[PDB]
Amino acid sequence: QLVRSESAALSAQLAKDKVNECVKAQSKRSGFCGQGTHIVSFVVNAPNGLYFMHVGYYPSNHIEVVSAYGLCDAANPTNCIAPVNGYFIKTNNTRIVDEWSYTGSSFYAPEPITSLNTKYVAPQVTYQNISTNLPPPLLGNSTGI
């Protein structure tokens, strides 16, 4: 009984950590709460402890696309952007050639590139030097009076 009781206290501390990390917050560490990507957790009482129900986001139907580390303005090479929480992908939307779009990191849905999903960075040798179609963040404003 002493051995079992000593084990149950460590288990209770683990349950405390799980309540504080998975139920009262969304956890960014994989595998701790559940499988996949953690979103929300619930807890109920069980005969001799707690019963956690972790809801996770499980992706399926993966496709492969081509992406760039970043985009730089060919005219002004020191003006570059990188995606924020997402990727720069090559579109095929029956439109202009070598168009670049933005997609979220966890679901494929190309969108226009804008200042809301990009951030300015220093140029790198792996960035793409694009000459035409210049997404709005890369548009060097030259509209004076």
Partner 1 sequence: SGVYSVSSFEAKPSGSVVEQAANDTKIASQLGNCVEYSLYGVSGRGVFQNCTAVGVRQQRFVYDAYQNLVGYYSDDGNYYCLRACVSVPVSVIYDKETKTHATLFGSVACEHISSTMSQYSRSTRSMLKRRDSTYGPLQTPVGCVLGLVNSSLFVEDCKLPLGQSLCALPDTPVPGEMRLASIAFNHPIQVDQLNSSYFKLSIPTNFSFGVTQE
Partner 2 sequence: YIQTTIQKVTVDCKQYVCNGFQKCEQLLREYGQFCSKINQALHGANLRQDDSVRNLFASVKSSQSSPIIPGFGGDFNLTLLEPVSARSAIEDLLFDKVTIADPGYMQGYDDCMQQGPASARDLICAQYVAGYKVLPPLMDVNMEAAYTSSLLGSIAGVGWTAGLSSFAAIPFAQSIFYRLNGVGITQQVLSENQKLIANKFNQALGAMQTGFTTTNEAFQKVQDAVNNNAQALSKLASELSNTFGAISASIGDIIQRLDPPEQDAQIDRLINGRLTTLNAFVAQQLVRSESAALSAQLAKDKVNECVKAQSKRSGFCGQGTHIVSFVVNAPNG
Q: How many residues interact with partner 1 (rule CB under 8 A)? A: 36
Calculate the CA 72 to chain-centre distance.
Answer: 22
Which distant-in-sequence residues (6+ apart) come within 8 Å of 44 by Cβ? 50, 51, 53
Nearer to partner 2, 87 or 128 (CB): 87
120's contact among partner 1, partner 2, none, with CB below 5 to 8 A by partner kind, is none
In Å, how far are 1, 12, 13, 78 from 7, measured between CA atoms? 10, 9, 10, 60
Residue 138 is classified by DSSP as: G
CB of 132 to partner 2, least distance (A): 26
Q: Is 54 in the site for partner 1 (CB under 8 A)?
A: yes
| Residues with Cβ within 8 Å of residue 118, at least 6 apart in sequence | 81, 82, 83, 84, 102, 135, 137
| 106 near partner 1, judged by CB under 8 A | yes
Partner in contact with 30, chosen from partner 1, partner 2, none, beta carbon below 5 to 8 Å by kind: partner 2
Q: Which residues bind partner 2 (CB under 8 A)?
A: 7, 19, 23-26, 29-32, 36-37, 39-40, 42-45, 57, 59, 62, 67, 69, 83-87, 103-107, 109, 111, 117, 122, 124-126
